Amino acid sequence: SAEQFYGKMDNQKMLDLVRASSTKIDFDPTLLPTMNSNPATYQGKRKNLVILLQESLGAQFVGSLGGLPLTPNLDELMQEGWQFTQMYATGTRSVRGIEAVTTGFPPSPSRAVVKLSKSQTGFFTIADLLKEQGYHTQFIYGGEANFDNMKTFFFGNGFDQIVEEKNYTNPGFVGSWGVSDEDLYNKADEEFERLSKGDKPFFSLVFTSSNHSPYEYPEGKIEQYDSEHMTRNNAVKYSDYALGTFFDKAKKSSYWDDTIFIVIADHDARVFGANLVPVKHFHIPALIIGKDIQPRKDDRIANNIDMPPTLLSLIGVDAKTPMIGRDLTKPLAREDERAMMQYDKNFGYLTRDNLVVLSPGEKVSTMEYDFESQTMKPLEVDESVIDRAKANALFASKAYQNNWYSSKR
Numbered sequence: 001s002a003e004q005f006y007g008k009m010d011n012q013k014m015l016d017l018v019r020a021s022s023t024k025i026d027f028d029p030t031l032l033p034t035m036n037s038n039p040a041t042y043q044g045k046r047k048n049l050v051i052l053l054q055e056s057l058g059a060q061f062v063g064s065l066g067g068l069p070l071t072p073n074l075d076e077l078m079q080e081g082w083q084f085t086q087m088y089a090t091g092t093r094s095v096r097g098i099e100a101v102t103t104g105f106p107p108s109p110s111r112a113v114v115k116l117s118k119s120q121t122g123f124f125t126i127a128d129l130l131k132e133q134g135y136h137t138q139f140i141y142g143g144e145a146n147f148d149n150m151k152t153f154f155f156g157n158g159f160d161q162i163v164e165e166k167n168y169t170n171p172g173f174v175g176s177w178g179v180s181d182e183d184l185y186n187k188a189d190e191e192f193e194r195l196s197k198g199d200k201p202f203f204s205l206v207f208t209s210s211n212h213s214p215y216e217y218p219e220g221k222i223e224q225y226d227s228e229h230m231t232r233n234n235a236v237k238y239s240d241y242a243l244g245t246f247f248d249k250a251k252k253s254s255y256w257d258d259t260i261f262i263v264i265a266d267h268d269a270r271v272f273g274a275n276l277v278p279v280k281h282f283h284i285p286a287l288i289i290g291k292d293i294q295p296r297k298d299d300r301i302a303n304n305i306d307m308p309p310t311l312l313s314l315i316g317v318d319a320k321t322p323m324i325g326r327d328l329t330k331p332l333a334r335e336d337e338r339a340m341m342q343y344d345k346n347f348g349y350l351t352r353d354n355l356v357v358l359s360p361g362e363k364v365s366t367m368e369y370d371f372e373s374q375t376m377k378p379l380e381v382d383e384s385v386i387d388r389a390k391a392n393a394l395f396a397s398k399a400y401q402n403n404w405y406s407s408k409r
């Protein structure tokens with residue numbers, strides 16, 4: 001319970017600050033307290049939606065984002081689309097990255113809702129929204145889908161089909177975590193060219209697996225970055241090569257005209273025993289790419305929970321949902337740029353002007369964040385800056401307790 005760590009706040013005061021700081025409009029709190037209507041920016045025939053979730057792909061491993069020269073295929077694709085240079089994960093764990101891009105639900109000191117008992121059925125997801133709207137919905141994974149409780153959460157919440165390890169006929173390579181990312185990506189391309197023959201728009205979540213210790217992946221596929229074959233750096237570089245092979249196929253495919261793709265990490269590679277909130281380690285790549293998506297370098301501070309409202313808007317789906325994440329196809333004032341991030345028991349609220357970190361024992365730290373340096377210094381802020389952070393720190397914990405985030409509509 002977030003109340004126990006950060007202090008109490010009246011539901012009214014809290015909700016008001018959450019709704020106001022969200023920038024969402026047309027709220028209807030009779031059904032659910034943050035239910036809001038957002039019409040899609042795109043208004044043509046509904047597009048397919050492909051989410052290519054990148055296991056542990058932190059910005060530190062991305063060349064185009066200043067880090068190690070580990071992602072030449074992605075770097076190139078970055079120039080070809082809507083690149084987010086100030087994107088932050090809300091968490092450090094895979095299930096929280098799945099939480100963020102399938103539900104848009106903000107973080108708590110607890111586990112992501114993929115693993116919580118109340119969220120196993122009838123929780124809000126874009127999966128069941130799109131399903132209710134006539135979409136086929138699927139999850140493509142290389143390993144065992146029961147892992148991290150994913151299959152159960154996905155099946156209970158709007159996913160139709162689950163494609164997992166048992167469904168791969170002849171993979172080029174199999175490791176401890178399942179088939180390599182190239183096999184995953186061949187399977188994706190197979191499923192998409194399949195679904196595109198059908199009548200339905202589809203929504204697909206595809207989640208990489210190669211980038212896990214002990215780092216098994218095929219030989220002779222990249223000029224390795226490290227001398228040892230099985231390293232994190234090389235697994236990332238393998239995954240990059242594997243993504244490039246997906247897009248080479250994707251661009252000459254029958255679904256290309258009709259689809260929006262997002263390349264986004266679930267979180268950065270974990271760091272341990274960090275103090276407060278290590279901002280740099282929530283920093284992640286995000287790329288939206290597709291026909292009619294124009295190249296753009298977007299420096300607006302955002303979270304991965306802003307992606308589902310953004311993507312629905314891009315694919316032509318009007319969204320009456322309780323999501324408080326931003327539709328970034330629409331203007332966002334500089335003072336509204338923000339990132340929430342949860343590092344275990346610590347919650348951080350990053351804006352262009354300040355960074356507020358809340359820790360157990362109701363301790364409050366206030367800082368100015370140097371974006372170039374990726375370092376922070378002490379800084380005094382208005383009570384309104386602390387209250388906005390606290391209000392957002394508490395929301396998911398309270399919404400979960402009170403069932404404020406259901407799929408009822």
Ligand SMILES: [Cl-]
Nearest residue numbers: 091092093096
């Ligand atoms: Cl997390």
